[PDB]
């Protein structure tokens, strides 16, 4: 089997990536953010505290004939960023793109913190990372991926996110007309529960590339690349005006400065970020002072290849026993 779906960018930022999701019988089609840094698929409810849903599609599992109550279950998440959520589970069928696992697991919201809330396009998040993050007690569940892997033509499921436009998750095969020239593959860790890889070097603008290792996660469920600080600084120190602001929370840099492009070595071979990609546009409404979308991952713990980075290529989540990751330009 296959599957493939479409995923829009949420804002005209690409602040987050949605993609609809068939979850019930009969199907209840929710948008929801797939993440690759993440393992849980859960969604707002009829479960949801009323005061916390604004906007969202809400998943009714006493409306789908399928649901089943995983007993005893629970879940409650807390990601980087301050925002949480929790709640109770079910087992339904899901599908994606014409892809369909039944017995999923779907993580219904009780409660969700006001920055997901917030996100009125945003109905849950589907997690792609690998299931030893999975959060639900006293039973780990299985990510759709997972789930869907023996199926699957292949132990595969592509990310091909667009910029200010349309893109495409496929589960299964690799659409070879989707990128131009080769895959190059590197190695990953699953020792975090994440999709963790060595970067071979950076190079600024039209600059010569520095060989370094840089160890990261690839995560569709970030916006912007955070990279080391030395990286971070090498590349604003070309931009004239930028500058890291501890009030703002980052580097910023004048709106009206055209960005140098940022290459990400992916072992001998090289991803090229358009300088435009790096733009986030007014601080607040009808700033001039624009931020950055390179940042440090100091005080993070870790690099993250957030989607700045992955929308640049076309990129392989290989499952197979030992897993890796593919790049390609596209």
């Known amino acids: 089997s296959t599957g493939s779906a479409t995923t829009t960018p949420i804002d005209s930022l690409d602040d987050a990536y949605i993609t609809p999701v068939q979850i019930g019988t009969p199907a209840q089609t929710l948008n929801l953010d797939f993440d690759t840094g993440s393992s849980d698929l859960w969604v707002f409810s009829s479960e949801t505290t009323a005061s916390e849903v ?92 997972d789930n869907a892997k023996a199926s699957l033509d292949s132990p595969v499921f592509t990310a091909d996110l667009g910029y200010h436009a349309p893109g495409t998750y496929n589960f299964g095969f690799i659409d070879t ?25 950076y190079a600024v603008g039209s600059g010569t590339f520095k060989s370094t290792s840089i160890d990261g996660i690839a995560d569709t469920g970030t916006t912007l690349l955070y990279l080391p600080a030395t990286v971070v600084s090498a590349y604003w120190a070309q931009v004239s005006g930028a500058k890291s602001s501890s009030s703002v929370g980052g580097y910023v840099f004048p709106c ?75």
């Open 54 to 145: 604004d906007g969202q599609t809400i998943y009714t599992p006493s409306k789908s004939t399928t649901a089943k109550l995983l007993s005893g279950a629970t879940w409650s998440i807390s990601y980087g960023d301050g925002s949480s959520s929790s709640g109770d589970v079910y087992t339904d069928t899901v599908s994606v793109g014409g892809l369909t696992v039944t017995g999923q697991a779907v993580e219904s919201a009780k409660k969700v913190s006001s920055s997901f809330t917030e996100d009125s396009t945003i109905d849950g998040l589907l997690g792609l990372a690998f299931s030893t993050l999975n959060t639900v007690s006293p039973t780990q569940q299985k990510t759709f991926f």
């Open 177 to 201: 007309t989707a990128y131009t020239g080769s895959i190059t593959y590197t190695a990953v860790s699953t020792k975090q529960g994440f999709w963790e890889w060595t970067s071979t070097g």
């Open 256 to 330: 009206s400065a055209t960005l140098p492009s940022f290459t990400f070595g992916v072992g001998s071979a090289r991803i090229v970020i358009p300088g435009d990609y790096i733009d986030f546009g007014p601080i607040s409404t009808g700033s001039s002072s624009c931020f950055g979308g390179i940042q440090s991952s100091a005080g993070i713990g870790i690099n993250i290849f957030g989607d700045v980075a992955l929308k640049a290529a076309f990129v392989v989540f290989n499952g197979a026993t030992t897993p890796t990751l593919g790049f390609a330009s596209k």
